Ligand binder design. Structure first.
Ligand SMILES: Nc1ncnc2c1ncn2[C@@H]1O[C@H](COP(=O)(O)OP(=O)(O)OP(O)(O)=S)[C@@H](O)[C@H]1O
Ligand SMILES: Nc1ncnc2c1ncn2[C@@H]1O[C@H](COP(=O)(O)OP(=O)(O)OP(O)(O)=S)[C@@H](O)[C@H]1O
Ligand SMILES: Nc1ncnc2c1ncn2[C@@H]1O[C@H](COP(=O)(O)OP(=O)(O)OP(O)(O)=S)[C@@H](O)[C@H]1O
Ligand SMILES: Nc1ncnc2c1ncn2[C@@H]1O[C@H](COP(=O)(O)OP(=O)(O)OP(O)(O)=S)[C@@H](O)[C@H]1O
Lengths: 686, 67, 67
């Protein structure tokens, strides 16, 4: 009996449940199912976390409030325990004995208890379809759309017996009203304050970026995380307290080594350490005591919050008993006093709260969202200000020249972190054209080591793999039922793992026009579905296309080709597939240019440095004359070929005799090498 | 049932989101499907679903489930 | 709510060892408050999957440890 008896009405009645906000039509629909005589049994259809179990519970809250109509008065709701049903069925039939006994006190309970069953797939049933088919029971179902697919669609007996309830995903402002409903619960259990732009920003950013989960529950868990976190920072020991704790505990271990004397007249000179000891006991003890008094203040305000909720419990019981003494007492009674000393306490926390913080706000939500995906709002000023202001410097460490492109990408990042972007767009979509000579993907790796601090995360994809029809089945995944389906394409996989990254595209001449147009679903709207069945966001991810349509002709047509004309013969191959949807929906068309010779000197002295790392691997050093470096300058240059004979001109000219003299055992470690020039071939000398 | 031919920057997708924003009061309720993915034979199994004995036979395609 | 986290990565990156050094910080008492004294136990399968040849056995094991 009681083993399977689980009431919700006592659970709302004991206040264990939570309020529901603004749900009328679906509850109306549910009552309208409840008054049916046959097929009188509703099934909730909804996404995960849309709130189905909450709808049943708050319906029972309308029951215990007596707000329900007069057919529903006195009626009860029992959720079912499948886990107790499976518990104990030793041999065959004892289960159905339990189930028929449930059918029998359903019978003699006589339409009083409306049954609720969640997890409808779990449910036997062969003895249910007749009691269904009459309507002798009155049960309430709740399940998912794909359990609706795999589960109920195959039985025709159930779909005669049940009704669909479309629990739609609730809107933004609706959700804000819900959070205004639950903010008292989480302010109590989480002991802190909550402002309203935290709520509005929670709905805005949660709805905007996190596209995997649904309203309201994602923003709910956001508030649960932030309030838990600020409760942690309160309950943890503060930063002056713990930094000064490290300094005093180093002074106590240093004091433990200094009071221990080997020569007391020598080692007990320590007077400075002990007056610094008493000094830091003063500072540590005073910030300690202020921390104690502030914690006592938060204890007091938590007591007045708690007894406020005690008054709410007693006034809701006063709605039950209808005590005119208790209702007039708690209307005019404790809570005016509780508001006076409450507001005096909050002003007093206006004064005393120096060290700790209580009122959770927008920046905390920014840090939390950053600790899912990776983009903060407020934090980026203080640390990031420096490499933001030195970004062009930083790229001019690894990448010389082409300051146009540097300004372009740096402006794009500033529009990104600034808050300027269209939300229905990716951040950056750049095409890199003209000649080469320049290290285009070298610039890409400069970004990879810039923001992700390594070239690993910068996912690179060739287009010259992708000329086939079958190329799309490489990069996006497979159609259903076939070879490669449940594995997907690694592009959508990598973006769906870490959302906001930098995607490298290469040599784009050799691709397929569908990949160009799948890519047109990339640049437009920043989203893309797979073969597997869902879409993937792009709208805070930069795509970069290094291409060669220029250097296919520009290093040939080095006279007379202008940026517009390079757009024309670019639009020879380009103009057919790429359209002003494509060509307009790329961001900037960066052309490049050939190299100055001093640039080549800069690249050469760059390339020296990692060779010096190879020397510090083995304990060596190269000196060079200015003139032998000038020889590398006059050898490395080629107009058509840019700077690019540089490194192989170098190690081909100098590292071959270097490798001979090293592998001979000739060259001793601990010594200095100078690049002398015994004659016009450069020679390394100990 | 409509065909829209014409230039770029005319607002075709804007017209679609304008209508979906008109009736259904969002631009998310609109069901979007590329046709330029669909050059191969397998695309009918993509948007419709797979024949029996298979995995997408258990799932079903986009347009079928959506409508 | 959402009390329970997920660790995602490659193997060997230290997920189980993150759980370990966490528990070490707990028994060192270097944990923040409330968790001081709270205990961490690892549940396996294999003690679970013992001789439930008939229906209802394993389920009643799990229900019993839930209580
Ligand atoms: N309007 C609302 N008021 C209060 N809580 C809500 C509301 N909408 C959703 N919730 C919460 O949403 C959570 C998850 O939804 P459920 O009620 O359990 O049913 P669900 O939508 O199917 O999600 P599940 O439990 O993952 S199947 C519940 O714990 C509720 O607290
Ligand atoms: N101007 C330059 N500044 C710095 N490094 C350069 C320059 N030009 C070439 N490099 C080097 O050249 C190598 C490759 O450069 P890349 O980035 O591949 O040029 P690219 O245009 O991307 O060529 P691809 O990949 O064939 S399109 C790297 O070692 C770069 O450091
Ligand atoms: N009349 C317009 N009103 C508002 N925005 C417009 C208009 N015409 C073009 N746009 C903008 O240009 C973009 C492209 O327009 P679309 O709505 O996509 O129609 P389109 O120019 O034909 O491109 P398609 O749909 O891919 S052929 C839109 O997303 C808007 O940003
Ligand atoms: N930061 C670390 N400090 C110390 N040991 C580590 C660290 N990271 C990994 N290890 C070692 O790597 C082993 C394997 O990592 P795990 O802790 O098991 O997490 P894991 O990445 O889940 O690997 P699994 O268990 O194979 S999936 C640990 O048992 C440690 O011995």
């Amino acid at each position: 009996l009681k083993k399977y008896t689980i009431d919700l009405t006592e659970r709302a009645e004991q206040g264990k449940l939570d309020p529901v906000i603004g749900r009328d039509e679906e509850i109306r629909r549910t009552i309208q199912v409840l008054q049916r005589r046959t097929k009188n049994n509703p099934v909730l259809i909804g996404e995960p976390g849309v709130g189905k179990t909450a709808i049943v519970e708050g319906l029972a809250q309308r029951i215990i409030n007596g707000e329900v109509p007069e057919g529903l008065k006195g009626r009860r709701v029992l959720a079912l325990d499948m886990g107790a049903l499976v518990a104990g069925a030793k041999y065959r039939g004892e289960f159905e004995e339990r189930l028929k006994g449930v059918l029998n006190d359903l019978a003699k309970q006589e339409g009083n208890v409306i049954l609720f069953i969640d997890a409808l797939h779990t449910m036997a049933g062969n003895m249910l379809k007749p009691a269904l088919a009459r309507g002798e029971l009155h049960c309430v179902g709740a399940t998912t759309l794909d359990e609706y697919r795999q589960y109920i669609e195959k039985d025709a007996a159930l779909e005669r017996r049940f009704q669909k309830v479309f629990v739609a995903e609730p809107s933004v402002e609706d959700t804000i009203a819900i959070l205004r409903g639950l903010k008292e619960r989480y302010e109590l259990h989480h002991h802190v304050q909550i402002t309203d732009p935290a709520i509005v920003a929670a709905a805005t950013l949660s709805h905007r970026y996190i596209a995997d989960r649904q309203l309201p529950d994602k923003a709910i868990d956001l508030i649960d995380e932030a309030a838990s976190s600020i409760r942690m920072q309160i309950d943890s020991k503060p930063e002056e307290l713990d930094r000064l704790d490290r300094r005093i505990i180093q002074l106590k271990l240093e004091q433990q080594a200094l009071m221990k004397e080997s020569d007391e007249a020598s080692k007990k000179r320590l007077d400075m350490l002990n007056e610094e000891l008493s000094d830091k006991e003063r500072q540590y003890s005073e910030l300690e005591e202020e921390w104690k008094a502030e914690k006592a203040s938060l204890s007091g305000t938590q007591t007045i919050k708690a007894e406020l909720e005690q008054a709410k419990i007693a006034i809701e019981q006063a709605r039950r008993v209808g005590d005119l003494a208790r209702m007039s007492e708690l209307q005019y009674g404790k809570i005016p006093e509780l508001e006076k000393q409450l507001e005096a306490a909050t002003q007093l926390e206006g004064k005393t709260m120096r060290l700790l913080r209580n009122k959770v706000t927008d920046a905390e939500i920014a840090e939390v969202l950053a600790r899912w995906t990776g983009i903060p709002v407020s934090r980026m000023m203080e640390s990031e200000r420096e490499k933001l202001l030195r970004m062009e410097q930083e790229l001019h460490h690894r990448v010389i020249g082409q300051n146009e492109a540097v300004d372009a990408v740096s402006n794009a990042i500033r529009r990104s972190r600034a808050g300027l972007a269209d939300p229905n767009r990716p951040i950056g979509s750049f095409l890199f054209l003209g000649p080469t000579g320049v290290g285009k993907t070298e610039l890409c790796k400069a970004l990879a080591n810039f923001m992700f601090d390594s070239d690993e995360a910068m996912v690179r994809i060739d287009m010259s793999e992708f000329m086939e029809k079958h190329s799309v089945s490489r990069l996006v995944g497979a159609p259903p039922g076939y070879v490669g389906y449940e594995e997907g394409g690694y592009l959508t996989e990598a973006v769906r793992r870490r959302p906001y990254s930098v995607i490298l595209l290469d040599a784009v001449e050799k691709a397929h026009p569908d990949v160009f147009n799948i890519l047109l679903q990339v640049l437009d709207d920043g989203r893309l579905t797979d073969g597997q069945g869902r879409t993937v966001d792009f709208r805070n991810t930069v795509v970069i296309m290094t291409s060669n349509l220029g250097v296919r002709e520009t290093e040939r047509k080095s006279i007379g080709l202008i940026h517009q004309d390079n757009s024309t013969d670019a639009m020879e191959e380009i103009k057919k597939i790429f359209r002003p949807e494509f060509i307009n929906r790329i961001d900037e068309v960066v052309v490049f240019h050939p190299l100055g010779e001093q640039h080549i000197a800069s690249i050469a002295q760059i390339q020296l440095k990692r060779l010096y790392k190879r020397l510090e691997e083995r304990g060596y050093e190269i000196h060079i004359s200015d003139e032998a470096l000038k020889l590398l300058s006059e050898n490395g240059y080629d107009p058509v070929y840019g700077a690019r004979p540089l490194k192989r001109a170098i190690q081909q000219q100098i590292e071959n005799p270097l490798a001979q003299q090293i592998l001979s055992g000739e060259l001793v470690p601990g010594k200095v090498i100078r690049l002398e020039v015994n004659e016009d071939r450069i020679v390394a000398v100990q």
